[PDB]
Each structure stands twice: as C-alpha cells, then as structure tokens.
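README, section 4: Worked example with a bound small molecule

Sections 1 through 3 covered apo chains. Here we extend the same pipeline to holo records, where the ligand is supplied as SMILES alongside the sequence. The molecule in this example is magnesium ion. Nothing else about the input changes; the structure line simply encodes the ligand pose together with the chain.
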Amino acid sequence: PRAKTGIVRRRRHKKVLKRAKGFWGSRSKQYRNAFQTLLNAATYEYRDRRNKKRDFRRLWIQRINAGARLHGMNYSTFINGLKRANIDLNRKVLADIAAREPEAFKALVDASRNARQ
Amino acid sequence: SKTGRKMYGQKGTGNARHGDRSVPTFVGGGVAFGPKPRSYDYTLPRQVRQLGLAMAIASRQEGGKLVAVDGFDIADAKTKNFISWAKQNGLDGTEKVLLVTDDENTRRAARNVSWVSVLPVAGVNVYDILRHDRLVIDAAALEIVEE
Amino acid sequence: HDLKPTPGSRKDRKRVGRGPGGTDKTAGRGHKGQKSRSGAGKGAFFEGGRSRLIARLPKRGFNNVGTTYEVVKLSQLQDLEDTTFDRDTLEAYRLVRRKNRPVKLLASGEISRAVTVHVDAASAAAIKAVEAAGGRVVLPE
RNA sequence: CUUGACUGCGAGACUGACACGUCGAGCAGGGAGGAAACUCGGGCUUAGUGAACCGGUGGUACCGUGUGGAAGGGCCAUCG
RNA sequence: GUAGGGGAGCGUUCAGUCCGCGGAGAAGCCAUACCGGAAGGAGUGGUGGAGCCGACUGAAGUGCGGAUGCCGGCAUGAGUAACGAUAAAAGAAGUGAGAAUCUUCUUCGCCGUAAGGACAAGGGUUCCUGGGGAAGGGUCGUCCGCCCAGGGAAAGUCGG
RNA sequence: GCGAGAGCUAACUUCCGUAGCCGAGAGGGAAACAACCCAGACCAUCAGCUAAGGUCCCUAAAUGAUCGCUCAGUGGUUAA
RNA sequence: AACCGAACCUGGAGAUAGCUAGUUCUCCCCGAAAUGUAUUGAGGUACAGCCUCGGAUGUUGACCAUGUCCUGUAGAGCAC
RNA sequence: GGUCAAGAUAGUAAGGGUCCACGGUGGAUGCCCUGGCGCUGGAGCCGAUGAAGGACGCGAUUACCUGCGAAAAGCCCCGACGAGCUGGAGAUACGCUUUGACUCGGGGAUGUCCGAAUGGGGAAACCCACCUCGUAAGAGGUAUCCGCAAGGAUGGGAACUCAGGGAACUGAAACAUCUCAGUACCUGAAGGAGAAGAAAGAGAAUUCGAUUCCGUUAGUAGCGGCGAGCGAACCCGGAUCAGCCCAAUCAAGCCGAAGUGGCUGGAAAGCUACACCUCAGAAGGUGAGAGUCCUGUAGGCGAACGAGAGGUCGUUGUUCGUGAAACGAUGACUGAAUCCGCGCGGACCACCGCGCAAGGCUAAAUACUCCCAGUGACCGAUAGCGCAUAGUACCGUGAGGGAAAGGUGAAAAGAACCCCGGGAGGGGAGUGAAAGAGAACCUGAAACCGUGGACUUACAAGCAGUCAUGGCACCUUAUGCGUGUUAUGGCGUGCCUAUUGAAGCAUGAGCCGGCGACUUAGACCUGACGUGCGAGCUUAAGUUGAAAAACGGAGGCGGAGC
Ligand SMILES: [Mg+2]
Ligand SMILES: [Mg+2]
Ligand SMILES: [Mg+2]
Ligand SMILES: [Mg+2]
Ligand SMILES: [Mg+2]
Ligand SMILES: [Mg+2]
Ligand SMILES: [Mg+2]
Ligand SMILES: [Mg+2]
Ligand SMILES: [Mg+2]
Ligand SMILES: [Mg+2]
Ligand SMILES: [Mg+2]
Ligand SMILES: [Mg+2]
Ligand SMILES: [Mg+2]
Ligand SMILES: [Mg+2]
Ligand SMILES: [Mg+2]
Ligand SMILES: [Mg+2]
Ligand SMILES: [Mg+2]
Ligand SMILES: [Mg+2]
Ligand SMILES: [Mg+2]
Ligand SMILES: [Mg+2]
Ligand SMILES: [Mg+2]
Ligand SMILES: [Mg+2]
Ligand SMILES: [Mg+2]
Ligand SMILES: [Mg+2]
Ligand SMILES: [Mg+2]
Ligand SMILES: [Mg+2]
Ligand SMILES: [Mg+2]
Ligand SMILES: [Mg+2]
Ligand SMILES: [Mg+2]
Ligand SMILES: [Mg+2]
Ligand SMILES: [Mg+2]
Ligand SMILES: [Mg+2]
Ligand SMILES: [Mg+2]
Ligand SMILES: [Mg+2]
Ligand SMILES: [Mg+2]
Ligand SMILES: [Mg+2]
Ligand SMILES: [Mg+2]
Ligand SMILES: [Mg+2]
Ligand SMILES: [Mg+2]
Ligand SMILES: [Mg+2]
Ligand SMILES: [Mg+2]
Ligand SMILES: [Mg+2]
Ligand SMILES: [Mg+2]
Ligand SMILES: [Mg+2]
Ligand SMILES: [Mg+2]
Ligand SMILES: [Mg+2]
Ligand SMILES: [Mg+2]
Ligand SMILES: [Mg+2]
Ligand SMILES: [Mg+2]
Ligand SMILES: [Mg+2]
Ligand SMILES: [Mg+2]
Ligand SMILES: [Mg+2]
Ligand SMILES: [Mg+2]
Ligand SMILES: [Mg+2]
Ligand SMILES: [Mg+2]
Ligand SMILES: [Mg+2]
Ligand SMILES: [Mg+2]
Ligand SMILES: [Mg+2]
Ligand SMILES: [Mg+2]
Ligand SMILES: [Mg+2]
Ligand SMILES: [Mg+2]
Ligand SMILES: [Mg+2]
Ligand SMILES: [Mg+2]
Ligand SMILES: [Mg+2]
Ligand SMILES: [Mg+2]
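The generated complex, written as structure tokens:
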C-alpha cells in the first residue's frame, strides 16, 4: 500500500508559520525562511533567558550605586557595609527601596557606613 | 515505458544533469522501492498450531462460552427451526456464534443467520473461534478427537 | 482482537535517514568512502588491494570422501534402555538415524548388564568391554 | 681429532595488525672431541633475503573412480 | 556533543477487531490566548456536503528545505527591452457600438532585369460570394492568408 | 607551549615527539577574533559568592588608599 | 539532416562510477577517530588501536607513596 | 490675558511595514469512480473460401467514434425476450413494431480498393490489360513452388518453445585465458503449447528401468591466471505415465421468500413501535445507510440451432579452462566386425558387470498469457498502463520519441423574463433544500495580486531575530502568566553541504505546493530478543479439503573427535 504525504506536511508547515508571525517579509510567509529564522531565534531565546538574568542584575546595581552616591556613599562601600552589619538584603529589593522608598534608603545608608568604620 | 535515450547534454545546458525520464526522482517515472508480487506465508510448526487451537477452545470453556452439542432438532434444513432451537439453548441473539458439526441440514439452517457463522468439519482455527463470542462445539468429534 | 504480542518478541525495524532525531544524513555510513556507495560487491574476503592470507598459505593434502562411520554410544545402549536389543530397524526407531552409511559402536561410558550388539563395525575396547559384561557383537560377513 | 652446518621434538618467553621473525632449557634415537665435569642441533652478535601458486627431482605406498593393477595425485624431502 | 551503537516512543496509510459518530451534518480546509517532556493531540467557533474519529493488533511505496533534484503554478527583473529594415505619408469622404490602422477619393513617397508578369517544386481551400471578431495579427481593428457557411476547378490536340 | 630535525634559530611553513585545546565546546575574558587566559551549558528563577579579567564615560564595578617613577602621549608596535 | 577523432534511433541497461551531490519524526544514554602496518597503494580498501551494546567475571583499573632493578638525554668533562 | 524670549513635545504619509477582515489567482487536500495494476483459473491460433491491418465509402443533417460494405449504422432463417425502438450523440423531421419489433444467443447470405496480393505494372489503396460465358449491365479465371490428379505451401501472432548465428559493457578492484553468457540481439520453423521419448542408459546394489517437471541430494562431489568465481549426478520423495511400428456438460433465458405505522428531513433506505422471510444477510441502484421497493442472490428449470561405429588432425559439450582425457559431437583425411559378434564402465590391461548404434511416430504432466473471468492488508487523477483513454496532439526526412487531460444536481427541473453592454460579463427573478451547485459548474490549501481597518513609519546603519520596558488597540480556549501592534534598549555572523577551520567574497537554492532515496528475494550465513517441543527439534515438493487447515519423513539441523 502507498501512503502519500497527504496531510502531514501541510500540518508541520502551518505549525511553523503560526510560530512565524510578526516576522518581516518572507520570514513570516515562506516555510523555509520561517523555520530557519526560528533556528536562529532558538539560539536567541535560550541565551537570552540566562542573559536577562544578567541584565536585570546590572540594572538593580546601577540604581543602588546611584542611591549610595546620592548621599556620599559608593555602591561598593554601601553594599559592603550592608554585608558588614550582615543586613542580608537581595539587591533587587535594594533597588526597590532605593528608588521608591527614600528615608528607608537613608537609614540603610547610615547603617552601612556605621558598620564600616 | 520511458525509453532509454539520453535526454540532453551531460554538461553544458545550465540545467541539473539527467539520463532518462524513467527515474524515481521524475514525475511519471518508475517507483523506487515499491512492493512487488510476493507471499507473506510460512509454515508455523505443527506443535503450536495444535497448542493454539486448544488454548482457544479452553479460553472459551473457562469462559464459559462453550455449548457442547449432541443432536440438533432443526426440522428439515429450515432456518426458522435453527432460530428456535438456538433460542431454547440460550442463544438470545446478541452474540456471534460459530457452528462446527457435520450435518448439511444444520448448516443450511445456520447459514443466512446474520449473527452466526458455519464452519464445517475439521477446518477450524484460532481465528474464527476467537473471532466470535460463542462456539457451537459440537460434541461428536470432541471427545473422540481427544482420542 | 483480545490478544497482545510477547514483550520483546517483535522489534520494530530501522528506517535510516529521517530527521536529526534520529539517524541524520549519511545513514550510518559517515562521510564518503567506498563503503558509502550504492553498489554491490566488495566483498568479505577482499583485504586491502593486496594478496590474501587466504592465498598466501600452503595447500596441504587434497580431498577424499570415504566411508564415514555413524556413532553409537555405550551410555546409550546402556543405562535405562533396558535392552530391547539392537536388531536392525530397532535402533533406527530409537536414536541412531542416517541411511546410506555403516554404524559404528565405540566406548565413552561404563558397562554392566549383558547385551548383544548388531553393528556394522566397532572399536576394540567396545567389543572388549561388552563381551566382558556378558554379550556379543555381530559383524557382517 | 673431527661432520652437531643431525633427524624426532619443544617447557617457556622476546617480537610483530596479520603473516613472519628471534632466543631457548630439557627428552629421545644416535654421534663428536676431553682422561674428565663437559660442550655442540653452525660462525661474537645484529645484513647476506621472496609468501602462495604452477612444475623438476629423490624417497614414500595414503588416494586411485565395478574389481585388482598402472597414469595421475597426496605426504617428507627438495630444485626454479 | 560530530561520525557511530544503544533505549523509549510521536504521525501516515492499508488491514483484522471492538467502542462508536454522522444530512440537527463526515472527511478535508480556515482562524485561535488550551493540553502533553517532544515528536503531537484536544475544546469551540466558520467552511464543506457524505462519509469518518477512537483502542488493540498486523503489514508498509511511512514523515523532505535542500540533490545546478522532477511536475505545476505563481512571483523578481518591469510597466523596463523590443513591436522585425529610415520605400513616407497627408487631407477629405464613408462605415461602425467604437477607426492613426477597414472602404471610397484626391494627391505624395518607393520598386521598375522588380519590390512587374508567367511557370515548376512544395503547400492544400489559403481562390470567389455572403457573413463573423474569441483567439491568430507584435498596436488597432468594423479588417485579414484567421472563424462560419455556400459556391469555384471542365481538354481527343497543353502536361503525364 | 616545551623538545629537536629539514628552512634563513623565515612563514597562518613542513616532518616527528610531548601537554593542553578546537575538531565534537556553548558560557564570561582577550574591542572584534576555532586554537589563547577562566570554565565543561539536565530544565525554571526579575536570587547569592567567586575565576580569568576588570572598576573615569561609552560599559557592570574604588575618579581607592599609602611609598614612589616617567612628562616622552612614552603608555599605544623594532635594532645596532 | 544545425555541436562527427567516429552519425542518429532502439536495445544490453537500472552497464560501471574507489568520484560529487542528496539521504525527511522526536526525546534520552553513552561517545570516537584522522595513529600503526601492509597495499599498481596514497582523497581508496585489510587488521589492529580508539566508540558502543550485552553476557560473563570481581577491584585485576586508576591515580599516589614505598621498595626495587633498567637508562646514558640536560648539564659537564677532555680520559680515548 | 497680549507681545517678545528660552526650552520641550504633537499631528500630516507620497509610499511602505506587522496584524486583521474580505475577495482574486491557483488546483494541493478530502470524497468519489467511468481507468488501471498484479495473482489464480479458464480459454489459445487466423489466412489463397483473401488473414492480421488498412484505404475509400454506406446516414434525412455526418466532422470524430462506432457498425457496415455499392444488398453498405445493415439483409434472410431459427431460438430466447415481450414493449418499446430509431448507434455513441445528448438534434429535429421521417418512421418501425404485440402478424412480436429493439436487444440477446445461433447459423447463413452480400463484403468495393489496398495489403501473403496473386493476371502485368506501381510511389500500398492506384494504372493498363488478355481469356471464358452474357443481350448488355455483369461473373469467373489469368503468381510461384510440391504433385498424375485431388490437394498442400506463401503471410500474421504479445510472449512460451526449438534451431542456424551469436555481442559487448561488466567482474577478476588494471587485462588477455576467464567471467559476464549461449545472456542481448538477428534469423529459420512450429504449435496451442513445444521440446524431449521407448536405453550400445544411468550406474555399483550382480539395483533401477523412455522422457519432460518439481522437491531433494547440494554450494556436496568436482572446475579454475586452483584467482575472481563456476557447480553436477546417482539414490531418496512427488507430478504424470505408453509405449507403437518398420528395413534382408458449458453457450441465450426463464422462475424465484418475506413490512408497515408514526418521526426528523429538501428527500427514508436512517430513528422508532410492532411485524414477517431465510437453502435467499454477496452485491449494486433508489433524493442519507433498504435482508422484506428494484435488479438480484440460495434454489429450481433451461432451448430448435450451439459448443465439448572405430581411428588421425582442428574443436567443442556437459562441474570438463589439454589436465592422466574417458564418451558423445561434427570439418577434413580414413570409412572394421554382424553373434565363438558389437558398444560402455573417465587414460590404458585382464577380469567382471550394465548394454543391442547404423530407421520413424508418440498423449500425459511442463512454459507462456494478446484475450475471458474471479479475487486483493494493489492504485484512485504528479498515483494507477503512456492514456479515466491517445500512441492521438506535438517533435522527428526517418527509425523512432510522445503529453496534461476527471467531478453542476437527487433529478436539467440547464435559468422564460426585466436590467447596464455591440459583447463579454454581471445584478435580479424563477427552479432547488442549497444557485454559500449556474454550466470557466465538489471540496478550493500555498506561493502570488489586490480593497478596507487597526497600530506604526520620512536624522536612519539592518541575517531582520531575540529579550526587557513604555505606548496604543482588542477581549468567543480571552481581563492576565493576556492577545495584536508598536517605540526605546540590551544582545545578536542566513541554512545546508564540504572542511584543519564558514556569515563567509566557498557549494546548492526565485517562491509554494505535490512526487522524491537504506528495499526486496533466498527456505543461504551468523548473531540478539522471543516462543513451541526439548536429547531431542523439523519438514519440502506434493495430496486432499478450502468462507478453514490437515496430511505429507524425502531430506535438514543436533548426535565424536583427530
Ligand atoms: Mg550569574
Ligand atoms: Mg542557473
Ligand atoms: Mg536509532
Ligand atoms: Mg555527503
Ligand atoms: Mg575523508
Ligand atoms: Mg594464481
Ligand atoms: Mg614424485
Ligand atoms: Mg605413482
Ligand atoms: Mg481500520
Ligand atoms: Mg479516509
Ligand atoms: Mg524544492
Ligand atoms: Mg547561482
Ligand atoms: Mg515609463
Ligand atoms: Mg532597468
Ligand atoms: Mg529607460
Ligand atoms: Mg523603446
Ligand atoms: Mg513594421
Ligand atoms: Mg518610420
Ligand atoms: Mg467621395
Ligand atoms: Mg453612423
Ligand atoms: Mg500604416
Ligand atoms: Mg514576380
Ligand atoms: Mg480573400
Ligand atoms: Mg490585438
Ligand atoms: Mg458593422
Ligand atoms: Mg600542509
Ligand atoms: Mg571533521
Ligand atoms: Mg567558547
Ligand atoms: Mg570565548
Ligand atoms: Mg564579546
Ligand atoms: Mg586564530
Ligand atoms: Mg581577582
Ligand atoms: Mg559605571
Ligand atoms: Mg554537421
Ligand atoms: Mg548487462
Ligand atoms: Mg545509471
Ligand atoms: Mg560525557
Ligand atoms: Mg594520514
Ligand atoms: Mg576494524
Ligand atoms: Mg591496582
Ligand atoms: Mg652539551
Ligand atoms: Mg495613496
Ligand atoms: Mg470511419
Ligand atoms: Mg427473429
Ligand atoms: Mg429487451
Ligand atoms: Mg453485390
Ligand atoms: Mg497486383
Ligand atoms: Mg573490457
Ligand atoms: Mg575490471
Ligand atoms: Mg512464422
Ligand atoms: Mg580430440
Ligand atoms: Mg571444451
Ligand atoms: Mg569420441
Ligand atoms: Mg485532486
Ligand atoms: Mg497519470
Ligand atoms: Mg448574459
Ligand atoms: Mg493598508
Ligand atoms: Mg543627526
Ligand atoms: Mg524620526
Ligand atoms: Mg540535510
Ligand atoms: Mg579546504
Ligand atoms: Mg554574501
Ligand atoms: Mg554562499
Ligand atoms: Mg567544490
Ligand atoms: Mg532462541
């Protein structure tokens, strides 16, 4: 008995083309370029998952550095005197405190400096 | 039917190279790895034919969908008589039933029956039996086919 | 339809090619080679280009057919055969079957109960140990 | 003075992908020199070599086709 | 984790068998944010018009992006190049649904040992009348060597 | 990279040896960069410490602290 | 009879092709090799070496200390 | 609040982008069959009485097909059928037929011209004749060879068979013996089959007993640049049997059981409540799925006609390659015995065995499959033959090559009629269940072209993605982990193949569909899983039955090595 593709291929293909939208030109419309575009897209997804884990960390950091400096502290010195008084805060939170909660950041500062000297 | 003839130029054309039009990659051409006439039959060794057959009978005895039959009252070769007899041995009408006897009349009665099959003498097989719900045993060639 | 097949009694074949899953490309074959080629003939005794061990070696002797002798064992006329004797067709309808050859009886086991034999030939130690346990050996004329 | 530049073998190892190749105590038959214990199956050693195949030759009596013989063939030797 | 060997499975058809659906609507197709570890598979909505899903088992022409692969369709180049001899055209008149192109008229331009005329070889109704305008015409066509129908060809002396 | 040969103590050179690496290795670093320095990615996280390598801005992190040098933009490409 | 150092057509014929391309579903586990030795053999085949599956075996592996023998390079030296 | 000043940001889109809606293009997919394909079985020749195959003709209108032959879509006779018929073809008018048409079976008659062509010629289908009878119109004859005559031969046939002739590529990893292989092809003859056949045989048992066929022996004995590779037979089991003579019943047809009511529906066959048949539940048609409507099936009948010697030299055949070369087999030279004789037993000799050369026929089993029928884990429109038909269109001076082609509906009820236009085309109407079927008439994928809409886009540098955030939009697995779109940021070297190393300025490819490649065979080899019997395991050819399988010990594997 013979068994044409009949259906399967159109199936596979559409799957890709439905992943494949928003894509500029041919990419969103022809299979090969679509599936392809998606190979690379794969690479970018994986890496950029861990990557965003980096990037956010960076962001939090610069916000804290700011905070410290807003009084007279370095990031490194603030964070270090916040290791010294053992104030074991996540730094994401520290950003949050720093930019949305003023006088709190103030206190955490005075603390870090105290524990530093 | 797609003659040998080289079709065009081996080099030169600016086209992919081909030889004939009778080829697996051509529409029209012959099939590559197609089926041909064969025969999937072999000789399963005796031993296990017997052991199967048996195991089938059995499987339907501890069922228990056996009806060991010594007689048959089905007038002269008529179907309604089959349906009646049947009715009075326990044959509601909601099962598939496989006759094994030797009396032409009983078969001729058992033939048109939508819910029943009619296997004559020896030609009996694990299929038909398992193929069905009930075995019309019968009885005669059962204890003597034991030995 | 009830049934089912013995676990491991039917292995699904290999269809090579088909995906990276999977046996990508190549089909087991690797990259290039004479092996790579849809073509018969290689074959199996073709070592190198070369000249083979096969033909590097001394051809000793020749080939005689000869009369080859059908084994009968002691521990088979012996133990629990309970002497129905050897007769002719009798041993055939038991456990020593060929045709178009002559039967030989030779040792292997030990000897007790008295039996007379009916073989085409036999070993010295055989006639010896079977007479010394109560029975003859019928060699043809 | 001599023919151990010897037949029948081979414990155990070196070596090599394979095929080869290398060393060897000891046992037998039977010798050689020493008065002896001994030593010898080639040279201080490591180069001085060519697998199969087909054929010559000296033994050998395993095969030889209905049978007994002979052709031919096998085995040891050996020559190209 | 490459060649490679091993392990478990997803989907396609045909087949045996059971659960079973379907004109109050099958398959196939179309949309989507649900599910599964993945091959995949469900819900509902729109399509369609007469067949089909599911489980277990069996057998395969059983899964394609590539082969300057094969068939077919449609894109790019592009409203580009070209419209096939630089012998050349004007105005009036007519017809038609529509005219630079078709039909009259009056001129102009070109061939004139030809670009005239008569045969042969070849072609085959292309000839004539009346009609048509899809396509053939390198534009247009009301026109034609294209389409339709009907007619036309006559030998004792030519030629066999 | 370390050992040597052929080269011209030439080569992104070639022929051996030897360790690691790429091949078949993603991740950070060396601007960029198969081989180099750190390091071997089973999925998830808007969680923490470190390695090589860094901390004026681009660009995360001391325009740090003290004892000095060079003033040539040396740094940021060579010699008698 | 529009490409003649050997017409075109059909056929053997699916000649051969150590060569070039191409070889489609998914997840998991392991995971190489480009060294040797031959080869009318060098971009090809044989055997080993290296992977993997499975059955046996039982710590025989592996690194590291010890003990113990083998060596003739680095350096050095001038005894041939 | 007006003027001026400094600073910030908005909107427009020529065009484009992403998404969405809606068509177009095209004809994938699903469904379907009016066409294939294979296996089993049946059947198997035609022709000088003109074959296959044609040319031209026959029609009320006739281009193609079909049927036919100037007696021309037909003519006579018989038989079945019994109401319609007047070929596909779907068109009018003409008619025919219950005195029996049409269709079917069975014979007959007529059958132009070409073609073995055959009165002679010829560029097939055309040209010109001579002779016999006829009043003419016509009819017959006029080839050649075997024969006394009567009579037979000529040509065609897909394969099957026999014979004369007989390649190469290939493999031996080069080649020449060798292998391909007496294969491809050419030719001759012949049949429904053919060939072979009635022992100077196999042979080794003083056994079998014509042949052909299958199983097996058996990849055994052997052959061979003893390399590649080549490869028997006797015995044993089956198929089918035969040994004779000469020279001193199917083919036309008929007849055949048993349901209605309500329900959905455009439509009942489906749902349903109760029914009956069955020797008949195989199938197909009927508005959607029918045992009980129809045609059928099980069954029963069934026709006038109808069919059932030796030797030598060069060589070769078998496993036979000069090898110890037997034997047959023939080309050239030689050409013995005929019974107290001849031939073989693989050189050769004796012995001892098997045999009757020089004359012929022979059914049966076996091979094939143009054709007929039945089936199918064979195809359904790129499949399947090349063809849903066509060797046609088209190409070729020729030999030769050679396509794509499928679908309205249940039924034509095929759209009178009004509207814009010359038309084409469309918009109504009307039919239908549906015109979301309208004749470019089933579904209608994708590339590809467009209209509309959302959000965006004119200081911007880009493998076109990713990932983070803001904007705007939307709310039928969908108000949160949202979906569409977007701005800004970070980050980021297409895919494949080939490689020491690929974004590579290295290979491939315009795009999307669909077709596209690790298979099959052998009762071979060797392994892993599994199973059934287990010192035991097993059949093959065949036989019988066959909506199934059973029988079949002939041989095979294990049994003991050297
Ligand atoms: Mg981190
Ligand atoms: Mg090109
Ligand atoms: Mg695998
Ligand atoms: Mg490749
Ligand atoms: Mg290579
Ligand atoms: Mg040789
Ligand atoms: Mg000799
Ligand atoms: Mg001799
Ligand atoms: Mg099924
Ligand atoms: Mg289907
Ligand atoms: Mg493609
Ligand atoms: Mg190109
Ligand atoms: Mg323009
Ligand atoms: Mg241009
Ligand atoms: Mg221009
Ligand atoms: Mg122009
Ligand atoms: Mg012109
Ligand atoms: Mg001009
Ligand atoms: Mg006028
Ligand atoms: Mg007018
Ligand atoms: Mg003009
Ligand atoms: Mg003229
Ligand atoms: Mg005219
Ligand atoms: Mg025009
Ligand atoms: Mg007009
Ligand atoms: Mg190099
Ligand atoms: Mg590589
Ligand atoms: Mg890396
Ligand atoms: Mg790196
Ligand atoms: Mg970087
Ligand atoms: Mg580099
Ligand atoms: Mg550090
Ligand atoms: Mg910073
Ligand atoms: Mg020429
Ligand atoms: Mg060939
Ligand atoms: Mg080829
Ligand atoms: Mg690992
Ligand atoms: Mg190398
Ligand atoms: Mg190997
Ligand atoms: Mg150890
Ligand atoms: Mg030194
Ligand atoms: Mg505009
Ligand atoms: Mg005709
Ligand atoms: Mg009649
Ligand atoms: Mg009738
Ligand atoms: Mg007539
Ligand atoms: Mg004639
Ligand atoms: Mg050759
Ligand atoms: Mg060759
Ligand atoms: Mg003939
Ligand atoms: Mg001879
Ligand atoms: Mg010969
Ligand atoms: Mg002879
Ligand atoms: Mg289709
Ligand atoms: Mg086709
Ligand atoms: Mg109209
Ligand atoms: Mg728009
Ligand atoms: Mg600017
Ligand atoms: Mg802007
Ligand atoms: Mg690929
Ligand atoms: Mg390279
Ligand atoms: Mg480029
Ligand atoms: Mg490229
Ligand atoms: Mg290249
Ligand atoms: Mg087993």
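What to look for in the output: The interface with chain B takes residues 1-2 of chain A (CB under 8 Å). Chain A has one domain: 1-117.

Section 5 describes how to batch many such records.
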